[PDB]
Amino acid sequence: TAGRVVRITGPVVDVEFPRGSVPELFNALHAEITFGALAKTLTLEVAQHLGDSLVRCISMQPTDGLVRGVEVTDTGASISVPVGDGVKGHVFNALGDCLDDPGYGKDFEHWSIHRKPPAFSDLEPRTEMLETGLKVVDLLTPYVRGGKIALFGGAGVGKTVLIQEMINRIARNFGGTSVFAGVGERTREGNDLWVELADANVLKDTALVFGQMDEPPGTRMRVALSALTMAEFFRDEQGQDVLLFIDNIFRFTQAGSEVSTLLGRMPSAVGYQPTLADEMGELQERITSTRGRSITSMQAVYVPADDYTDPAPATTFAHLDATTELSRAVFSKGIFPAVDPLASSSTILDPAIVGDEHYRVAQEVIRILQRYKDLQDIIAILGIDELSEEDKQLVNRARRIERFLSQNMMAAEQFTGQPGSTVPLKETIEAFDKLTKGEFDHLPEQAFFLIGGLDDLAKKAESLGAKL
Amino acid sequence: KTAGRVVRITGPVVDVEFPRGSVPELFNALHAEITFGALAKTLTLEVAQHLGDSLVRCISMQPTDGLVRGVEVTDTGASISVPVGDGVKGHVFNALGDCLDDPGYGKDFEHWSIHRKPPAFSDLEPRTEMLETGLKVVDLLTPYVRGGKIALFGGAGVGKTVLIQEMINRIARNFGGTSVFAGVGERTREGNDLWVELADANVLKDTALVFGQMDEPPGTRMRVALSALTMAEFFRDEQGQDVLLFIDNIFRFTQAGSEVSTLLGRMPSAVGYQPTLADEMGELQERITSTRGRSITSMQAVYVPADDYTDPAPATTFAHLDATTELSRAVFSKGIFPAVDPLASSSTILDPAIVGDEHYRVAQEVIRILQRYKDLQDIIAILGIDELSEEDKQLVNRARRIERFLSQNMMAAEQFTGQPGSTVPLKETIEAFDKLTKGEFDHLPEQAFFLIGGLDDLAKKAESLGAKL
Amino acid sequence: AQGAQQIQLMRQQLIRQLRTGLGAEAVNKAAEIVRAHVADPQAQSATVDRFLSELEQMAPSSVTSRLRAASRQSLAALVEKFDSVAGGLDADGLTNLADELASVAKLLLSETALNKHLAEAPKVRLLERLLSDKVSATTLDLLRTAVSNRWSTESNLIDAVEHTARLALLKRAEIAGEVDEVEEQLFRFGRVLDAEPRLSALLSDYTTPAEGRVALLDKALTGRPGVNQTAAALLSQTVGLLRGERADEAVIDLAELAVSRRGEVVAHVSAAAELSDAQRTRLTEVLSRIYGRPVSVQLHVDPELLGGLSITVGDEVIDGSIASRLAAAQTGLP
Amino acid sequence: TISAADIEGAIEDYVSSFSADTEREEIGTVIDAGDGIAHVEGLPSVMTQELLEFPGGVLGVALNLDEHSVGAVILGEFEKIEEGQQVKRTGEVLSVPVGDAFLGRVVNPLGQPIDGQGDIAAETRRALELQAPSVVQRQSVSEPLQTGIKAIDAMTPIGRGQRQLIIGDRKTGKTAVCVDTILNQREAWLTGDPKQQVRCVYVAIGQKGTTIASVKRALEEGGAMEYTTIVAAPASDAAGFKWLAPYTGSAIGQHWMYNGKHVLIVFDDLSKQADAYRAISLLLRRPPGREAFPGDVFYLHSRLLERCAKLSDELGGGSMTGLPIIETKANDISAFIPTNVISITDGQCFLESDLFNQGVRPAINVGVSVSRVGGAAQIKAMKEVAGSLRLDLSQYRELEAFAALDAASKAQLDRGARLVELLKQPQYSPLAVEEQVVAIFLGTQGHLDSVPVEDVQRFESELLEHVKASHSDIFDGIRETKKLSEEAEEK
Amino acid sequence: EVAQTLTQADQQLSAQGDQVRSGLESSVDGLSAKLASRILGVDVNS
Ligand SMILES: Nc1ncnc2c1ncn2[C@@H]1O[C@H](COP(=O)(O)OP(=O)(O)OP(=O)(O)O)[C@@H](O)[C@H]1O
Ligand SMILES: Nc1ncnc2c1ncn2[C@@H]1O[C@H](COP(=O)(O)OP(=O)(O)OP(=O)(O)O)[C@@H](O)[C@H]1O
Ligand SMILES: Nc1ncnc2c1ncn2[C@@H]1O[C@H](COP(=O)(O)OP(=O)(O)O)[C@@H](O)[C@H]1O
Ligand SMILES: [Mg+2]
Ligand SMILES: [Mg+2]
Ligand SMILES: [Mg+2]
Incomplete structure (x- = not known):
């Protein structure tokens, strides 16, 4: 009752199953790459049902060395990640495997990374300043406690430096839990952040989930969901205030668009996937503070080619309570942080x-x-x-x-x-x-x-x- | 029999079915016949792709008007070849190597296939020696390299061909070696004018002219450069002569390749160009080179579509050149001749x-x-x-x-x-x-x-x- | 220093051109020498014996794809039921069943609407209401069982009925005890069709009427004094039920199906010349050992191999061709 | 005239070598081919990215795998492929030989020599697609890689394990910067200390052959080839080699990096890799994206550039510094590939033609150029003297634009003009780190405020020469202790 | 001077190569015979 690989094209794999055994959508399936130099176990997420008992799946790890016809096993559930206070102080990848202590957290409770957003009746607008000590941020883009904060900007304008600054100025004395989702960014920056949190003694209160830019598009699609699942467990179960740092949220959309055509979808404007806004909406609506349960989320939003009209940041804008917009023009003047005071905004x-x-x-x-x-x-x-x-x-x-x-x-x-x-x-x-x-x-x-x-x-x- | 038959005809591209075991190799020349009175001729087809089921997709070197599905196609067993030797000097040829001024001339000459690999990397020797022209802007700001590669970029009507003629006058007249001129996708009357002028200046005897002009199918326009390059390569390798290779216009070779690629059913690249644009450019250009001890001084006119230097064709051409003279519409409008853009032109020496x-x-x-x-x-x-x-x-x-x-x-x-x-x-x-x-x-x-x-x-x-x- | 370095570079380059020229001439004349040497038949026999040996020492290993899951399962069930049921039928009954099934297959090909509407219990009732008496009881039973299952593509239905007709013809051949005769005839016919690609291509045009090509084959190849009747009829109905596939491909597929029903597998062995009967038995034994199941061996004579064996099965080849070794050695000289 | 041993004994060795054992293996058949792609039926056991052996020694790589067939890219000599030819499994994914024998050699993306200097003895083989170091297998970039360029070393410093992007229009000095950086490692190489040595790999993608020869000569003259390898995929090479060469160079460098060595890898340039990959993807009929590029071009560059890393002490502490090159068009950095690569690397050095024509050479655009490692990739003295040089120059350019004044504004303009003159540097004229420290000290501490702008350069030069003629203890102190002591500052 | 040295070296090495080509033809027969022996997996007299 196990399937077999039929077609392989980069990160997308078609798998055939016996009738009546087709895995559900988003189920995790396991294949084996037995080549010595690249031997590994592939996790595949069921993306589509193609009919005639075929499913199209997105590989989480590289498919190099995978062979047509190899057995594919259905785990019967979506990708699940460990949750609980035990994830604090450790580094995980998109699949919940601990990196600093391999095998750690294997026996924790595991939560599916696919989750519906909170019911509308549970939402309550947050209007409470989050002082940071940054003149421009405090004056022109006041942050919100339990609100949604973004740092928009082109490549190399200071988004990451400002995320680290906000970790210093907010997470250091924060009484609750912190979750940092490194999404499709540099591995060196992830290592630097890990070391810096260890030095600052903030690691013990922080869970780090890293899917870097060297990973295949599936990992970059699902790492944000994994980190958000940990943060959601902290918000709902532990009943604690949470700090959610995501850098860079645009990589989720970019990874989605990388596989869009390989999944058979007609491209939308500017080469993006047709389902841009909807996938973004699911993800962002999961990132929220419900009545009495606070998540203060700060996302770094990459603006491709400094084009703020680009569909990705343009769609992201609707999901934020405060937006600090960094400008290339201000950066090139030597003004730091390179905030554009005329473009940034805050609802409070x-x-x-x-x-x-x-x-x-x-x-x-x-x-x-x-x-x-x-x-x-x-x-x-x-x-x-x-x-x-x-x-x-x-x-x-x-x-x-x-x-x-x-x-x-x-x-x-x-x-x-x-x-x-x-x-x-x-x-x-x-x-x-x-x-x-x-x-x-x-x-x-x-x-x-x-x-x-x-x-x-x-x-x-x-x-x-x-x-x- | 070991002969094929036409199955599909789409413009200058023809699909030919062969019996299994007789499928021609890529780049083989095949012959078909058009029998209709006005257009009666012998089509030369070049095998371009193997489609499977013993089908080959081929590019026609002549217009396929009047061709009928099912006509016999014969495989010559070899790629297109052109005559080589000192006998080609002083004569005018087409892409296939037929002599135009003296039809039937050169049939008995040695024939070289127009397809060959570029020189081995260990045989390449960088050339840093100024070729003085007497033009102030060229000599001062973009000095030309003797044995190097020179290009003259420019939009429509900025003076590319006049500058090519100027460099023929200045460099080729007082030249002891051989000159090869390749008219590629340019005005036929320009070719006639060049022929007459070379005869008048007594430079024709030292020059070989190969013309595939605008009124040609794209296959001829994208293979005439290879024909002229083969003649130049014979002069460089088999005779140890200094060679002057003039090409006008190489962008026409690229554009003909784009048309052919559209016909062949390839997925278009940016701006509608063929996916294999840089690669075709690279093979052709890297065949044009001076090896160690054997000098080719090549000068190429590159058309710039819509004055767009960002266009993929000239953009990919830039990397293959030692000296680059970029003609400017802005400079041309001021009446400055040559219309060189001093801030955009460059030279490696x-x-x-x-x-x-x-x-x-x-x-x-x-x-x-x-x-x-x-x-x-x-x-x-x-x-x-x-x-x-x-x-x-x-x-x-x-x-x-x-x-x-x-x-x-x-x-x-x-x-x-x-x-x-x-x-x-x-x-x-x-x-x-x-x-x-x-x-x-x-x-x-x-x-x-x-x-x-x-x-x-x-x-x-x-x-x-x-x-x- | 630059001049000296260039002198050294050109010296080395000239040395390398001389080296490659010596390699080319040496390989060419070694090829000529071996071609002359192999002309002795005992040399060919010794080479075959050596390759057979190598096959014995070489250790064994544990190890219809175009069909999909649904079609494959349906076909397996139908063939199993046919084997269970029609086995007891008499040779004349088998011939009548095969003719009826071939007629049914050509009819279904003629009208694709019924196949389209049928691929997706009422199916049986439709079958009786359509052609209950137009076909025999066994034919109707087999057809209703065939429609009982579902098919990934409607074409799989015509493929299944053609497979059933071929199975019936093979069954009648087996009852007569001439399965080997039909197998050999089919292999020879496929060989000759492959030899003349033009004839196969001409026969492969489904556009032309089936009757004309059938008559061509009958009065050209199929109908001759030394042709088995069962093989003749099988090949005739196959060519009449063609859907654009090349005739040689269809013939080799029929031979593969016949050997599969026999329980063995095919093995196409190529050699410079025919091998002794003892060599044949040894080769069959070693192939059966290596693949663990009995395997029929078909011999092809082609002097270009100049000795050795070129066994091929299941898309994998064990090559012993002397020409292949010569080419490999030629490419093995830098 | 000839040793008569290799020429004659090579054949004897080869015949003693041709075991030519019988092999049982899966053979596929070429069903269609053209333009550098080939489809192969059969090969049920072939892996994704597996290397395939076509007749005549032609190699391909299996990229598309479906039930019908396998779409493969031919790695050169695609004109010998015909329908019906037999394709053989290799059983391996793309891999290249690696070892110390590659230093001073020119190879193709398969590792085979093309310099015509004889076979290379390979220490081992390495797959091209091995995973990059993880987050917990690295350490912070903390060792300076001295390029010898004052502007780069003082304003966009490069550490060992960093990816610095050299991006600019054609003929702006990108290759000049990279070759000068390679040549500046000669002094470190001669010390013989593997902790200081930097082994260089220069990948030429889609470059004209004679330009690769020019680079090789420039390296030989400066003694760089003693520690440099060149991986060449000239413009005539198959699109497969152009797509593959950066990975071959990365594997060659990774072999050394994982063995405790420090590697500097230059890609010249990734724009041509992206072009070749787009060509391959279009010929394979994979759906295109922006500018007809495949959806995974960003992945192509990111997974390549993420293998340039600084390893932890547990893994030997080696490093590979990446210097990718990007050629922008009409100075637009908004294009697809430039934006991708900029977002990938650890900073960028923007070279502008307008700055280059003004005499600002290297034409670093200070405002938009940046290093993401910063002071961590500098010695103490350089950090102190050049602490806020980049922002000072950005402010100076902004104020220069505004001014088209107050006393403070005039002082700022004068200081900025002097600093801009200071950062100018000829080609093939590296500066040792101590000389750079002293020159930047002159610029920033105000000792050039009394010198005419057009004299600054000359002044700088002479003064450095003076310090080498006498008072050489200052350079020695800076070089040894890596910091300018207040006593040395007074002196 | 370097051009003259290159020219004289060209002539000298061309003569060297011609002489080597003439001389080497004696032993190539043994090479080809041993190759034939090996590819036939048995000693060959010729
Ligand atoms: N040096 C010059 N002096 C005077 N007029 C000139 C000069 N160069 C060019 N012209 C004028 O410009 C016209 C265009 O010249 P030319 O045909 O060489 O340009 P081109 O760039 O090759 O054009 P095209 O794109 O049409 O092939 C010439 O016919 C002449 O009218
Ligand atoms: N610092 C410098 N001072 C003076 N000239 C320089 C300097 N750097 C580079 N050049 C010169 O500028 C020209 C362009 O340099 P280079 O070839 O390195 O640029 P590039 O951006 O790599 O060019 P391309 O696109 O042609 O490859 C060359 O003549 C080089 O000698
Ligand atoms: N506040 C600041 N002061 C000085 N330099 C800065 C500041 N913020 C950013 N930079 C410079 O800009 C670069 C880009 O910042 P970073 O946030 O790391 O990239 P991105 O904004 O693309 O995420 C940094 O490496 C740093 O050199
Ligand atoms: Mg960042
Ligand atoms: Mg013109
Ligand atoms: Mg360059």
């Missing part, structure tokens, strides 16, 4: 939640920066003197504000040698209220570059001669 | 180690000035030079004079303008452009630098315009 950025003063200051900053963006071209072509005195004042104010929104982050020390700094929310609001009022117009704009609070500003201006 | 420190320094200063001029074009287009600083104004005047001076009254341009061409020694070019960069001609009018040779012509034209040098 309104007078009701953050208070009148915070909202007024943030709106004034945004107005000034928008005006500066409007005048950029005129300044470049006709120079500055052709602007009105009011616009010259605004341009100076805007340049100083733009520099001050930069900050020396802890996780960025390795790249600058300058130890990071933290700025309380009240200090940020007061400092930017002073900036928008032209209080610090006498200081050079360079004094505002990569500093923390107002004391740092005074110190750096003094090092430059100017007096605050 | 423009380094101080090969051309000396003076040549390199002068060329780099010219390029820096022109780049700074191009960077200011945004401001100048809106406001003019008046808003630029004094340093920028001075650089802009210097750059405009330099860009005028890179133009030259070409030898082949006499037929258009009526003015005789000029040759400029390399040392004079270096010295003149050194003075231009320093600013020793900042007082002459710009028009004094337009379409002249060396500094003597500059002085004379300045005097005519009322200035003094």
Whole structure:
């Protein structure tokens, strides 16, 4: 009553079964590669029923060395991963195999990685600021406790550095559990994160699930689901606050699109799978805080070729409560974190939640920066003197504000040698209220570059001669 | 019998069924007959694919109009071959090797298959030796390599063929070796003009002409280059002669390959090109090369579709060249001839180690000035030079004079303008452009630098315009 | 230094061209020498004996694909039931059953609508209401059993009925005790068809009427003084029930099916010339040992092999051709 | 004239060698072929990616496996394939010989020599698709790989085990950077210490043959071939070799990396690998994606570049540093392959033609270039002197654009101009790490503020020469202790 | 000077190769005979 391999084309494998023994959709099947140099056990996830007792499956491991006709065994259940407090402090792969301690967690309770999202009647909007000590984030994109946070950005703009910074600034003193899903990213970064968490002593409270970019598309599709299953167990069963870090969530979509045509699906616009939005919706709707059970999730969303209109990030946008959007233009200026204050957003950025003063200051900053963006071209072509005195004042104010929104982050020390700094929310609001009022117009704009609070500003201006 | 029969005909591509055990090998030449009166002929088909069930897909070298399903097809047992030897010099041939000016000529010559592997890697020797042409822009900014590969990129009507004729005039006339000209997918009247001109200049006796032109099926257009290359290869290998291989236009070979691939049923690549675009380009180009002790100086005209240098064809062509002269529509519009883009053209031997420190320094200063001029074009287009600083104004005047001076009254341009061409020694070019960069001609009018040779012509034209040098 | 390095490189290159020229001439003249040597028949016999030996020392190993699961199971059930049922029928009954089944198969081919609507108990009732008396009782039983199961593709039904007709013809041949005769005749016919690819291709065009090609085969190859009647009829109905497959392919398939029913397997052995009867017995013994089951051996004469054996079964070949060894050695000289 | 031993004794050795044992094996049959692809019926036991032996010594690789047939890519000499030919299993997936004999040799993607210098003695064989090191088999990148280029070494430092992408338009100095990086390892090679030695692999994909010869000559002149291997897949090679060569080079490098050695692998360039893989996939009729590329092109590059890694001490501590090259088109980094590779590697060095024409050579675009290892891949002295150089230059470029002033702004513009002049460097002129430290010290500490901009370069040069003529203890101290002591700073 | 050295070396090595080709023809017969013996798995007199 076991099937056999019929067709092999990269990560997609067709398997024939006896009538009445066709595995259910998403069941995990086991095949064997007996070639010595690559001997292994292939896990195949049933993707489609092709009729005539054939099923199309997506391999989790590489199919090199697989032979047509080899026996395929149906496990009778979907891919399941270990759950419980025991997964904290260890590294797993998409299938739940422990990496640092092979064989560990084999006897834990196992949960299917395929799960329906919480019922709508259980949902409750989350409106509660999550202070981070980052001036730009706290002022213009206030994060939400138990909300959904994304860091959009192109390749190499600082998404990972900002994830690590938020792990430092949030997960260090976090009272609950942390789950980090490395999805289709660099193995070196995974090792670095593992070592850094061990050094910070945060590993004992964190479960790491890694499926890197060298893995086949199936692993990159399902690693996010595995990590989300662990986080869901912590949320629902243990009744504990959870921190869910995902880097990079776009790799889930990309892996899905890599196999879309091999599964026989007509491609959609921009080469994506037709089921882009639906698969994204299932995954993202699983990542949520239900009434009384909190998940504070922070995802890094890769924006291909810096094109924010690309279907992937464009579809992802709908699933977030706060979005910090990193810009290539800001990055190339040396402003760090390379946040685009004119494009980022937060649902709790309104007078009701953050208070009148915070909202007024943030709106004034945004107005000034928008005006500066409007005048950029005129300044470049006709120079500055052709602007009105009011616009010259605004341009100076805007340049100083733009520099001050930069900050020396802890996780960025390795790249600058300058130890990071933290700025309380009240200090940020007061400092930017002073900036928008032209209080610090006498200081050079360079004094505002990569500093923390107002004391740092005074110190750096003094090092430059100017007096605050 | 061991003969096949036509089963499918789709344009210049024909499927032929053979008895099992008689399936021709890939690239074999087959012969079929068209009997209809007006179009009666003998089709030469080249085996391109094995389809299974003893079917072969073949490319026709002549139009298949009038061909009938079921006609007999005979396998010659060998690929297309062309005559080789000193006898091919002075004569005009087609892709199949038939002589056009003297039909039936060369049938008794040695015949070489037009398909062969490129030279072994251990036989390849990099060539770093400047081939001086007398053109200021070419000599200064994109020096040509003797025994190397030169390309002239350009859109439609920017002066690719005129520049090819210019290089024939400058390099081929005073050449002791053999020249092979390959007209590929170009105007037939251009071929007739070249033939007449070569006869007039007494260069034909040292030249072999192979023409497969626009009004040909894609198979002929994509195999004529191989035929001419085979003639050049015989001259290089079997006779130890210096060879000049002129090709115009290689993009036509690529485009014919694309049409053939569409006919063959292959899945299109980007921009509709054949999936095996880079590979066909590579085989053809790597057959064009100078081995150790055996020199081929090849010059190829590359058409750029819709002035799109990003198009896959020229983009893949770029990697096979030692020197690249990229003609620009922008430069052409200003009346500058040759319409070379100094900032886009390049040469692998423009380094101080090969051309000396003076040549390199002068060329780099010219390029820096022109780049700074191009960077200011945004401001100048809106406001003019008046808003630029004094340093920028001075650089802009210097750059405009330099860009005028890179133009030259070409030898082949006499037929258009009526003015005789000029040759400029390399040392004079270096010295003149050194003075231009320093600013020793900042007082002459710009028009004094337009379409002249060396500094003597500059002085004379300045005097005519009322200035003094 | 560059000049000296180039001199060394060209010296080595010339040495290598000389080396490869010596290799080419040496291999060519060694090939000629061996071709001359093998002309002795006792040399061929000794080579065959050596290869047979190698076959004995070489240790054994434990180890209809086009059909799918549903079609395969249906065909297996139908053939088993046919063997159980029709075995007791008389030779004349077997001939009548085979003719009726062939007629049924050609009819079903003529109208594909019925096959389409039937591949997916009422099937039987339809069969009696259609052709209850047009076919004998045994033929109707076999046809109703055939339609009893389902088929992955409608073509599998016509394939199954053709298989049943072939089985009936083979059964009548066996009852007469001439299974070996029909097997040898089928193998020879396949051999000659393969020898003349043009004739096979001409016969392979299903577009032309079946009757014309059947008459061609009868008055060209099938109908001759030294042809078994059963083989003649089997091949005739096979060519008449053709669906674009090459005639040689159909003939070899029929031979394979016949030997499969015999319980053995086919083994096509090629050699420069025919081998002695003792050599034949030894080869059969070693093949049966190596594959663990009795295997019929069919001899092909082709001097190009210049000795040895080229046994092939189940898509795997054990080659002893002297020409193959010569080519391998030729490619073995860098 | 001839030793008469190899020429004559080779045949005797070969005949003594041709055992030619009888083999029982599955044979398939070619059913159709053309353009470098071939379909083979039979071979029921063939593996995915298995190597197949066609007649005449032609090799293929089984890529598509279905019930009907097997679609295979021919690895050269595809014109000898005919319908009906016999195809033989090899029983192995793609693998190449590996060993120390490959140093100084030019080979094809199968490991066979093409330099015409004789057979290579292979230590062993290695499959091309072995898994990359896991998360727990690595360690942090902490050893600097000195390229000798001031801009790269001070602003986008490369550590051992890092993947740094050299991306730019054609004729922007990408190969110049990579070859200079290879040549800069000569000093480390001569020390003889395997912990400092870097063995180099240069993969040429789709390059003109004479250009590969030019690279080989440039390496021979600088003594680089003593520790360098070249894997060549010139433009005339079959699309199979172009698709396969980076994997062959990676396997050759991995053999050394897993044996405690440090390897630098250059891919020149991955754009042509992607083109060849797209050609193969289209000929196999696999559905295409953006720019007709197969859906798994990102996987193609990612699994290749993830084998460049720094191994943990338990695995010997070896490393393989990757230097993939990408040729952008019209300076667009938004294209498919450039975006994929940029998202794969550990930073990038963007080379721009506009910067190159201005005299900024190497034409590193400071603002968008970055190293993702950072100070960890630098010695202490370089970190201190060049702590914030990249961001300083980004600010300088932004302010230069704005200014089209205040005293502070003028000071910033002057300092930035001096730093930009400082980072310029000729070709084939590497700088030792200590010289780089001193030059960057001059630039950043302000000692060039008193020098005219156009003089900076000359000044720098002369001053370094001075320190080599006398006061050489500064270079010695920097080189030995890896940090500039405050006493050495004062001196 | 390097061109002259290359030319004279070309002539000398061409003569060397011609002489070697002439000389080597004596022993090739033994090579081919032993190859025939091996591929026939038995000693061959010729
Ligand atoms: N040096 C020159 N002096 C004057 N006119 C010139 C010169 N070069 C080109 N032209 C003009 O430009 C026209 C185009 O020249 P040419 O046919 O060589 O261009 P091309 O790029 O080969 O064109 P096409 O794409 O049509 O083949 C010439 O007919 C002539 O009118
Ligand atoms: N630092 C440098 N200083 C001066 N010239 C340089 C420098 N780097 C490279 N060049 C020169 O620039 C030209 C282009 O360099 P190179 O061939 O390395 O570039 P590339 O991007 O690899 O080009 P391609 O696309 O042709 O392969 C060559 O002449 C090289 O000598
Ligand atoms: N806050 C920062 N300060 C200084 N450099 C930074 C900062 N953030 C990012 N960078 C630089 O940008 C690079 C890309 O950041 P990273 O987040 O690792 O990549 P990505 O944004 O693509 O995930 C880093 O390697 C680092 O050199
Ligand atoms: Mg990242
Ligand atoms: Mg033209
Ligand atoms: Mg290069």
